[PDB]
Amino acid sequence: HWGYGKHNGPEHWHKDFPIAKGERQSPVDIDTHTAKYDPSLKPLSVSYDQATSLRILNNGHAFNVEFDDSQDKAVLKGGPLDGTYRLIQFHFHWGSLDGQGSEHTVDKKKYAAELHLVHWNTKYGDFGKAVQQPDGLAVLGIFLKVGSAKPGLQKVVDVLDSIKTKGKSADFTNFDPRGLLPESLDYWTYPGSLTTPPLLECVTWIVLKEPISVSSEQVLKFRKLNFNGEGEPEELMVDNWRPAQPLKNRQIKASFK
């Protein structure tokens, strides 16, 4: 029964998930002036040519586009990472209004939404084991601003009306996640956590500096989803973001400038 409301939202999560007040919680504000340029960071390697999407699911918090991660297909490596991480799913966080929705912020700026491409470290064999490790996951975070449409998003937007409510899913094959990436792979990176319960401190965050553009009509369609299940009172799925958490004893590193 965690969620995003007054009575079960982010300020409550610590009662069931006490690491909410831990030492490497996400998201955070990225202060671009105090991010350190790290000339030892490598270009990010994103190899999505063989990605195999399976399904899209409304899980009552967001929607997940899920991939077959049983072979070495869609992998993230390089950047700040030490080995190979396999794509398992992406999802977004977004707001009720274009002025909020991202979880990370950039000099306190909130974007309209934020995409998370979740990958697990192949040295741990699967996602469930990888989340128990401090280097288990790598999440590629991409900001969304409202402007032009993102054509490579439209296939996702079009299916949403089939998964309006919690627990619905739809076949979702042949979706190419390369169509959601901006031109540049310049990034910031820091050690953090899941931004949703159970808030495990297992993620290397890689947040792209360049946002993607989506249209107002595309994000409106995200806002028509529902947190409730079918046959329950309608609670629009909006504002499903955790606010920025204290940076504590961490440094955010930049791959550029």
Using rule CB under 5 A, residue 242 touches Zn ion: no
Using rule CB under 5 A, residue 119 touches Zn ion: no
Of 12, 61, 164, 223, the residue at the interface with ligand E38 (CB under 6 A) is 61
CB 61 within 8 A of CB 3: yes
For residue 146, the number of C-alpha atoms closer than 13 Å in the C-beta half-sphere is 20
Residue 221: enclosing H or E segment and its boundaries? Answer: helix 216-222
**Interface stretch with ligand E38, choices 47-55, 67-75, 148-156, 189-197 (CB under 6 A):** 189-197
d(CA 153, CA 34): 33
Residue 14 annotated in ligand binding: no
Size of the site for Zn ion (CB under 5 A): 1
Residues 80-109, interacting with ligand E38 (CB under 6 A) = 91
Token code pair at residue 189: 């990176």
Start-to-end CA span in the chain (Å): 43
d(CA 128, CA 243): 25
118 binding partner (options ligand E38, Zn ion, none; Cβ < 5 to 8 Å by kind):
ligand E38
- DSSP3 helix / strand / coil % (the chain, rounded to 5): 15, 30, 55
> Min. distance of Cβ 119 from ligand E38 in angstroms?
9
Using rule CB under 6 A, residue 156 touches ligand E38: no
Using rule CB under 6 A, residue 198 touches ligand E38: yes
Using rule CB under 5 A, residue 116 touches Zn ion: yes
Using rule CB under 6 A, residue 245 touches ligand E38: no
Catalytic annotation present for 61: yes
d(CA 110, CA 146): 12
Contacts (Cβ under 8 Å, ≥6 apart) of 101: 93, 94, 95, 110, 111, 112, 113, 114, 144, 239, 241
Residue 196 annotated in ligand binding: yes
- Judged by beta carbon, residue 91 or residue 110, the one nearer ligand E38 is 91
Q: Residue 189: which region, alpha, beta or left (left: phi > 0; alpha: psi -120 to 50)?
A: beta
Using rule CB under 6 A, residue 116 touches ligand E38: yes
137 binding partner (options Zn ion, ligand E38, none; Cβ < 5 to 8 Å by kind):
ligand E38
User: DSSP assignment, residue 250?
Assistant: -
CB 248 within 8 A of CB 24: yes
25 binding partner (options Zn ion, ligand E38, none; Cβ < 5 to 8 Å by kind):
none
53 binding partner (options Zn ion, ligand E38, none; Cβ < 5 to 8 Å by kind):
none
> Min. distance of Cβ 195 from ligand E38 in angstroms?
4
Size of the site for ligand E38 (CB under 6 A): 15
Q: Please report, in range form, the residues annotated as the binding site.
A: 91, 93, 116, 195-196
What residues act catalytically?
Answer: 61
Q: Given the rule CB under 6 A, which residues bind ligand E38?
A: 59, 61, 64, 91, 116, 118, 131, 137, 139, 194-196, 198, 200, 203
